[PDB]
Design a protein around this ligand. Structure first.
Ligand SMILES: Nc1nc(Nc2ccc(S(N)(=O)=O)cc2)nn1C(=O)Nc1ccc(-c2nc(C(=O)O)co2)cc1
Length: 268
């Protein structure tokens, strides 16, 4: 990663937290193209020991440029804290957007977002790179739909974060049902098939107005939910329900490739 100086970063408002990270909007002073000076909005992700895992994952994905993958500017390793400096996306995380706009999101919008997300996962699948934390909070909305201009919404997938292969078991349990059954029994089972399961969970989120599946269940009950091989309920808008269940297959080898997923998406 390109190294950025603490002196060139200004921290502004907190935008929340993630798994062992705090999120801030900020401004980076930089020399850009043609030597012009810029003050650029940036997203700063701050590691509050786990630093190696967070930066390795973001790094390996930033080796692959793609229109549906988030852009990382570099890191700030100055001082005491370790900071990832990332493009600032105008409309934030999808999960809060879905909740703040539930009454105005229709199947055409959902299918366009599902197709884009699958296009990103297909690209990762072809490059044999595992994301490991596909969820609606990690979908960034770049631009909203404009039914005037007929322009569709546009999303990007955010960086993987700390790998489930190093997170404490009780955080992994709280991430059920995004983390697949085989990773709960062993996080070292992390595989390309892992992302197919979480992709199904994310389609469920996309269809449920920002509800978190199984949120009423405490950690012990989430474990028992996998133990009994339950599936998620079909959302009220059930147009994607079959795809969701096809993706959340308890047999990882039976989960369909993202090519087949895309073909299935196109058939609607
Ligand atoms: N690049 C970027 N740009 C913006 N912009 C923005 C715009 C508006 C708003 S607001 N307040 O008006 O709604 C908020 C933000 N946000 N952003 C981003 O990466 N956010 C983000 C942070 C953390 C996570 C995440 N961490 C985990 C984990 O578990 O570790 C799981 O997900 C996911 C996404």
């Amino acid at each position: 990663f390109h190294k950025i100086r603490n002196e060139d970063l200004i921290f502004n408002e907190s935008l929340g937290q993630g798994t062992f990270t705090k999120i801030f909007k900020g401004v980076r002073r930089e020399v850009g193209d043609y030597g012009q000076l810029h003050e650029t909005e940036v997203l700063l992700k701050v590691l509050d020991n786990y630093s190696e895992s967070f930066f390795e994952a973001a790094s390996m994905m930033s080796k692959l440029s793609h229109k549906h993958l988030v852009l990382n500017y570099g890191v700030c390793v100055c001082g005491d804290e370790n900071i990832l400096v990332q493009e600032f996306v105008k409309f934030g995380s999808l999960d809060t957007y879905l909740k703040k706009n539930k009454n105005c999101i229709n199947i055409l919008w959902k299918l366009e977002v599902a197709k884009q997300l699958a296009a990103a996962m297909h690209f990762l699948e072809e490059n044999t790179l595992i994301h490991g934390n596909v969820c609606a909070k990690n979908i960034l909305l770049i631009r909203e739909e404009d039914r005037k201009t007929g322009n569709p919404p546009f999303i990007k997938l955010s960086d993987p974060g700390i790998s489930i292969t190093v997170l404490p078991k009780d955080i992994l349990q709280e991430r059920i049902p995004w983390v697949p059954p085989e990773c709960i029994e062993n996080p070292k089972n992390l595989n390309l098939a892992t992302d197919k399961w979480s992709f199904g969970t994310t389609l469920w989120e996309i269809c449920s107005g920002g509800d978190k599946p199984l949120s009423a269940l405490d950690s012990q009950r989430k474990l028992q939910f996998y133990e009994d091989r339950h599936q998620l309920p079909a959302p009220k808008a059930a147009e994607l329900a079959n795809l969701i269940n096809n993706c959340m297959d308890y047999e990882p080898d039976h989960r369909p490739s993202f090519r087949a997923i895309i073909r299935d998406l196109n058939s609607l």
